[PDB]
Amino acid sequence: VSELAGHQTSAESWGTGRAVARIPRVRGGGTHRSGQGAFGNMCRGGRMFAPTKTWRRWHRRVNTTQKRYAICSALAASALPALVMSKGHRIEEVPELPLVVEDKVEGYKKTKEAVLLLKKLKAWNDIKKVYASQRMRAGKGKMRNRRRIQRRGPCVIYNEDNGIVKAFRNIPGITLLNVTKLNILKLAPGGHVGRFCIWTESAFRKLDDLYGTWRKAASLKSNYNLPMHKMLNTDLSRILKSPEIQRALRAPRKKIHRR
Amino acid sequence: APSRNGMILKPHFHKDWQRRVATWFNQPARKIRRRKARQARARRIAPRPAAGPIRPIVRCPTVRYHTKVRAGRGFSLEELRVAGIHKKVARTIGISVDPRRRNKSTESLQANVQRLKEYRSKLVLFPRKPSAPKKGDSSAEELKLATQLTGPVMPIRN
Amino acid sequence: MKFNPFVTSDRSKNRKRHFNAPSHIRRKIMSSPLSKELRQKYNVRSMPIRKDDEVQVVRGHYKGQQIGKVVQVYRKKYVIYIERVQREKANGTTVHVGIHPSKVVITRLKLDKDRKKILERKAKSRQVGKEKGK
RNA sequence: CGACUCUUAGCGGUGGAUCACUCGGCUCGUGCGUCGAUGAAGAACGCAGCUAGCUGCGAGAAUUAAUGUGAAUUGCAGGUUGAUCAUCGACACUUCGAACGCACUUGCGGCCCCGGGUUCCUCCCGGGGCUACGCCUGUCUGAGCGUCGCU
C-alpha cells in the first residue's frame, strides 16, 4: 500500500468531554468528512494496520546441492509408469515411458509435423485431455490477467534448437526444455513429482554426462555426483519374505483375548 | 527488558531508517543493462580486445597478501623505457600506462618487461591506411585471422 | 502467444483502447467478412463496412436470407443500420435496430476508387505472404 | 368472540448488505529525461445554431493551414477537386502573471511614424512602434586644485 495512505488528513482527538469516543477526528469545515475519525485501522478511510512494505522478504535461496537433488529425484520419478499415471497423464498407449526419439524431430519446422509425431507416439490423448481441461478460472484472478486456466501437458527435452521450439510452440500444454538447463519448476509441476516427458536421442545421451554415473563424476559440472541411497533394496515384501529373516522370528500370536 | 539468558544486542535502528532503504528489485535489470552495454562496446571496438588494455604484474602490498599477484593499474615509465615503448604510443597501441608507480626491485621490472615483449610479439597491428601499409605494421595475410578475445589479455596466474 | 514486449495483453488496457478509439480506428474495428463469391473473386477476407453496402444478417433475431442495404453507420455506438432490420415502437413509428458489423456479411461492395485500391493492396499483400510461405 | 400485545410463516414496504461485474487505483520495472523576457508555471475573462458543468480552444477562440487516412459527426436541426478522425513541421496565440512607461483604479503619461480634422497649422480622434532593473563588450557626450606635456 502507499506509504502515506490514510495519513493525508490533519486530525486531532477532541479528548475527554464532548461524549465522543476519543479518536482523532477531521477538524473543522462544513462537510460530511468533518469530525469523522481519521487515523486508526478501525476508522472508515484512514490507515490500515501494519501497512505492507515493499521490503518484505519475497525471495528465497536454496542450496545448489539441494536443487540438483530435487532435479535428480524428479528425473528418476518421471521414469516410473505408476507415478506418471498417478500424476494424471494418459500414457496407457505409450510404448515405453522413457520415451526417446531420434534427433530428426529436433529439426521440425511446422506444427503439423509435431502433431503427427505426437499422434504416432500415442501421446495425443494427453493433449486431448488438456483441451478438455481448458476452462475458466474461479475467483478474482479473472480480472488480473489470469483469465484462463488449463492442465499441464507433456514435456519435451531437446539438445539443440533447430525449429523444435517453433514446431511445438503452439500446441497447448507442451513444455519445451533444453537438456542442459532443466528446472524443477517445470519438471515437477506443482511440487508433485512424475511429469510425462519425451526425450530426444542427443539429450538422453547427454544426461549421464550432465549428472554423472555412480562411479563417474559429472563431467559438465565442477564436482557433482548422484546422491547416495539410504536403503538399496527397498522391496519390503522380500525383506520380510526371505528365509534368513523368517528363521529368526517367534511364532505370531494372533488369537484375540476379549474381556 | 532482558529475558532469562541471552546476548546483549545493540540494533542500530534508532534513526529514521525506514526512509533510507535500498531495495534491490532492479538487480536483474541492472545486470541485463550492464551486459547489453558490454556487448555494445565489444561490437564498437571491432578487432580490439573486449577486456581492454593489457595490465602489469604487481604484488599485493600487505603481510596478509604479499604472496599473491594481482593485475596492476598500468605499466610504469621505467618498464616502458627499458622495453623500448614510448609512453604516448603505448596507450594508443593498447598498453595501460601510469606514471605514479615506482620500481624498487628488479624481478618485478623484468617480469613486466617480459610481459610487454610477449604482448608486442602477440598483437596484430592493422594498417594506418587500409590501402598502403607502413614499415611498423603487420602484413596482410594474418589480418584475415584477427578476432576479438574474451577475458583479460594474458590472464594473471599465481 | 504474444511475444512482442511493446504490445499489451492487459484486459483493462485493451478495453479502454477499444472504447475510446478515435473514429479512424473505429472504421478499422467495425469490419465484416465478405461473402464466399466476393472472397474468391478478390482474394480478400474482410473489409471495413461502408454506408451503402448490402448485407446478409447471420446471427440474432433478424438472421435470414434477405439482402439489405445499409442506411448509415453509427460509429459512436459501434453499430450499423440496415434498411430492412427495424421494429415499431409504442406510438407506431418504426426505428432501426442496431446490428454489430462482426455479425454481418457483405453481398457486394460499393466499388469506389479508394475501395478498389484497398482491395488490390490487401490481395497483393496476402498473395506475397502466401508466396513467401511456399 | 372483539381490541391490544407476543411468537412463527407467506406477501408487501423500509433499507441498501451480500454476490458478480471494473475505461480506477497501488506496487515494481524499462526507455527517455525536454520550461522561461522569441515572455514560463499559475490565474482571470471570453469562444459552440441550440451549451450550464467537464473537456478543448484564444477575437483566425469545441479551432486555421499542411500531411496521412478515406465517407462520416450525431442529441435535434442545416449543408471524392476529399466528410470525419489522427498526426502536427506552417501560421496564430485576449488580460494579469519574473511582468517590463508610471501605478494597480484599468487611472495618467512621453517620444516617433501613418490614417481621419487639417488639406501640417497647430489641436482632437483612430492605428502602429518604442519607453523596467541589473550587467558585459564596443560607441558617443562628459567631469575631476588626479598624473602630466606645449603655450
Next chain:
RNA sequence: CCCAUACCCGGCCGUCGCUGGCAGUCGGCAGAGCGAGAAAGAGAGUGGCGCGGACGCUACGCCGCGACGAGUAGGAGGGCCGCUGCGGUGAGCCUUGAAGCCUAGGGCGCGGGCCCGGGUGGAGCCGCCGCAGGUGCAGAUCUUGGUGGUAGUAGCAAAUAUUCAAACGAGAACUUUGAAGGCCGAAGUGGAGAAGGGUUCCAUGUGAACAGCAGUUGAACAUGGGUCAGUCGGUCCUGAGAGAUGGGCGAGCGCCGUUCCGAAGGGACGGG
C-alpha cells in the same frame, strides 16, 4: 424411609498407559497352532474321487486389554472447521441455470460447520495435494451507514385585532377588490442613502420541492427584460501612514532606512 455430578454394576465418547498384537493372505507346490503356571525345538537326520476355503492391511492402517476425565491466567496438539489468492490435479460442475439470498422441508457432526429439497436469481464456481495471507467479532463512551421506542408526544404563546361581501379557482381563515374596526404616531411599522449583499429589482407562467398550517401567494421555481452623465461620484491632492532607488546590513530569500555616507534638474524666456 428420602436423595448429590459421591460410591458399586452396566453401556457409550475421549485421553493416557501396555514404548501391547497383526507383514502368517505361510493353500492339491497347502495342512490352518504358538493362552499355555514353570528360561528355553509340533527340531533335522545316522547306526544297534469331488480342484475347494468369509473379512483383512488408507501399517500415518486395523485390532485387544486396564486406568482415568474440574478449570481462570497460561502452555501444547488435532481440526475431512471456515475466508481470500497462487502451483498442481478432478477428460470436475454450469444458461436443461453458477454465485448470492430466503425457508414451518430431510439429515450429518460433541463442536467449529456442512450436505440435500423448495423458492428467488441471472454468469460464473467448487472438491483433493501443496503455497501464501490485509484470514473468523458482542462489546473498545469502537468507525461509517441505516432504523426504532420515546411519539402523533414536547411544541407551532414576546411586541392589543380582526370582521362582512364579491371575484378568480378543483380547492379560500391566509390571494385580490370594496366596506368596517384597529395599530405604527414624524426619535415611525414612513420616504431615501453608506457598508454589505449580487439579480434578490420588473413582467408573465407554475404550483413538484422550499416559505416548520395553508396558499390561487412569494425575496421559491421557470421564461424573458432592466442600470444611458463634461456638470452625480471615482479618477487628482495630501493627512496619520505605506513604500523603491542611493547607502548600509545580511549565509540567504531579503531587511533597515525616506533625505539620511548620492554627479538626484532631461526643463526654460531669450541670444547665436
Next chain:
RNA sequence: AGCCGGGCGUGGAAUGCGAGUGCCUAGUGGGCCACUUUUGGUAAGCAGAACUGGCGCUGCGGGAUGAACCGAACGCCGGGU
C-alpha cells in the same frame, strides 16, 4: 591416605511406588477466609504473623437465602446405595 589383587549375597525394619537427567519457557510478583497458636487495639466484617486446608481457578447435595461452613469435587446416560 591412595592404590592393586583376593573372599564373602539370608540385598540385612514395615508399607508403598518405575526412576534419573537436560534444554526452552508463558502467566504471576494487589490476595482473602477458617480451627488451632499469636502481636497491636476497649473493640471491629480492624491492622500484623505461624501451620494446615480452602476461596480465588469450582460446579454439585445440605445450611430457606449466601465467594470461604458440613458432605463431596464433575466426561454423556440406566439401575442400586
Next chain:
RNA sequence: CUAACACGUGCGCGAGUCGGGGGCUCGCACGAAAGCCGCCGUGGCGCAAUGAAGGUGAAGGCCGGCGUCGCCGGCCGAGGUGGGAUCCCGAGGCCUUCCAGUCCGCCGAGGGCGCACCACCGGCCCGUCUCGCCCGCCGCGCCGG
C-alpha cells in the same frame, strides 16, 4: 513486517560449508525465472586458546646403551577407577519304542569387550606466584630455552 540473537525441530553436504556480489548463457510469454562458473571461495562462519600487551600456543608409556645412566637407539602408542544400553563367551539345559550317535536352533551360572553419558583421579596449552638448577650460541648479553 524487517533486522538481530537464543534454543528446538526438518533437509543437503560434512572438517568443511555457503555464490547472497559479479560474470557466462541467441536477454525478455511464463523468464525480473532457471542453469553454469571452480584458477570468480575474494570473503564469512568453523577448524585454537590464552594474555592488558610485548607474545606464547595444547600427551606420552615400556627395553637395549654408564639405577650412584650423562646420554643414543629398539620400540609401543593419546590415560586411569566406578557405573554403564547393546554385543562375545559359556558351566550347565531345551523329550517321547528303546539304544548308539549326530546336526541345527533356542535357554543359561558365571565371565569377557565395553558406546554415548555422569562422577572422580591424573596429564597437556596460555596468564600469574614460589623454589631451584641446567643447557644453546653468528653477535656469551639487563640474551634465549
Next chain:
RNA sequence: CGCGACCUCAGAUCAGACGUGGCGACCCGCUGAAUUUAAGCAUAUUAGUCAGCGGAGGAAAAGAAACUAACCAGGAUUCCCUCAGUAACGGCGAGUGAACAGGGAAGAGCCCAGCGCCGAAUCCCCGCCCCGCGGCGGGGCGCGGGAAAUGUGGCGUACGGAAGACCCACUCCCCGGCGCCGCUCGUGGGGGGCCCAAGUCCUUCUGAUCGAGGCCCAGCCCGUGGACGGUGUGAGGCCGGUAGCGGCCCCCGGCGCGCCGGGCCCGGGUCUUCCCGGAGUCGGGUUGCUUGGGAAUGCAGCCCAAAGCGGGUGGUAAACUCCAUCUAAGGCUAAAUACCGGCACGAGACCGAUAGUCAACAAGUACCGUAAGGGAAAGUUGAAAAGAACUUUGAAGAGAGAGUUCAAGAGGGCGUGAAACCGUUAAGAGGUAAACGGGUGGGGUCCGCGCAGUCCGCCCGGAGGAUUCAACCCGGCGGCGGCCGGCCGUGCCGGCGGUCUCGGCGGAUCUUUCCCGCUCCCGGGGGCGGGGG
C-alpha cells in the same frame, strides 16, 4: 588661461548580447530543532535529521595524490561485497562507529600561471566581394576601429622541460563546403503510415449463441499465428489483432567513398649547457562547531605569521636522530552510481466502490473558514430504449386496463436486494415484564412420493424353453519351472590391451635422453617460462 594625452568616474530609449521566475523525485552549498531514548535528567541520543534559505543538470558532486602503507610494496574519482557492528568514541551509561588491504562494475587522462624563446607572431567589431546559410561560419579586400606590453598567441607543467650538435625516421592529419555507394547488434539504426492463415460447415438447446454432438483413412481447417479484446452467455478459425531475419511507402540519422577549398609542416635516440613553480597561504595559539579520531579528524572567527636539501604526512604531547612517501595554497574531465517530479510504456500470488490514491463519477469539485488552510458524498435498467402508444377516474401527483421484453418478480438513484424496523394475512396464546435450560404432552406446515410389507444364496418338487455340459482336436495368449543365447552389476581377475597418439580426466610423482623461448657468461657454460616423455 588655453590646447592634448593618460588615469579614475559618470550619463544615456546609444549598437549588440546576457540574468531574473517555475518544477524540484534524484544532486550541491548553508542554516538547523524538539518530540523520543536514557525507565527521572542537564552531557549524550533523536541528528547534522525535520522545518527554513540559496543553486543546477540529465544526472549532480568527486577526480588524476602535499594518497595508502611499512609490505618481496600498491597507485585518479565513483559504485557493490567484505573488512565490521570491528579500531574507536560514550554521565565509558544509554548508545554511537569509520578506514586500509582483498574481490568485483567501470576505467581516460589532461591544461595553465611561473621560468624562458619567438619583430603581439594574439583577439574582438564594422564596410565590400564570393559560398551555403532554420545550431551566423569559411576565404579575400579595406593607410577601417578597438583590445592588449599593468602581457595575447605558439613551444612548455613535475611523468621533467628547453636550446645546440651528431645519428635515425621523415610526412597524412584536421577542418569548411559538395556529391556517391553500400551497411547499420540481438532482427538492419530510429520514427511514422498501410496490409498479410484458418468453419459462422451439418444437426440441436437459447430471448440471443461464443454452448452440446458430428465432420472417414488427411482422426473439419490453420498453426513460426491456441496472448488478449470486442461481438445478444463461455470464440485458435466472426472482427481487430497475435506469429513471422513478413511485405509496401515516407522521413531523419550514423558508418564508409569520392571531389573542391582551407590549416599543418610536425618525430625518435645520444652527448653538452641552462631552467624549474601557486603567501595574510602553510604553520602556531585560542575560541566555537563537527567527527570513530581519542594532549584537538575536519571547518570557521580572531591574534601571530613563514621556508627553500624547503614544506606536508607517517592515528599519544615534546626534544634529538635517521628513514619512507607526496609536492598544498590554480583549472578541466566521460563510465560504472542516484531518481516517490515529468513524457511514453510493460507487468503483478496486490485492492475490488466503507477496499484501492482524498478523488473509478462535472474531485482538489461541491461546501466551511477573513485567511493560512480544511475537504466530501456519489459506479451497475436492459442484448437492444424496444423508456410503456391508446382507453378510463382525478385539478394533479397518483392509479386501473392495454402494450414492449425471456423477464417490469428489470419502469429512468431501475442488477442481486440481507438485517434492524413496519403494514397486512394465517395459526396459536395471553393477570406474576419478557426471554431461557431439562422433561413430556397437544396442535400444526411439510416429508416418507408410506398404507398388506424386505431381499439374498443353496437346495426339493412341478410346469416349460435353449444349439447346451463334460471329455477330445485345432489355433492363439498367459503364468510357472529347467536347456541354448543375450543384457546388467553400487563385483572381482587378467591381456601384448585401445583413433596417429596406439583411449580420455586428474596428480604438491619424476624426467644431464627430453625440446623450445627468455636472461646472465667469453659458437660456448648456468638460471627462469612453456612444450614433450
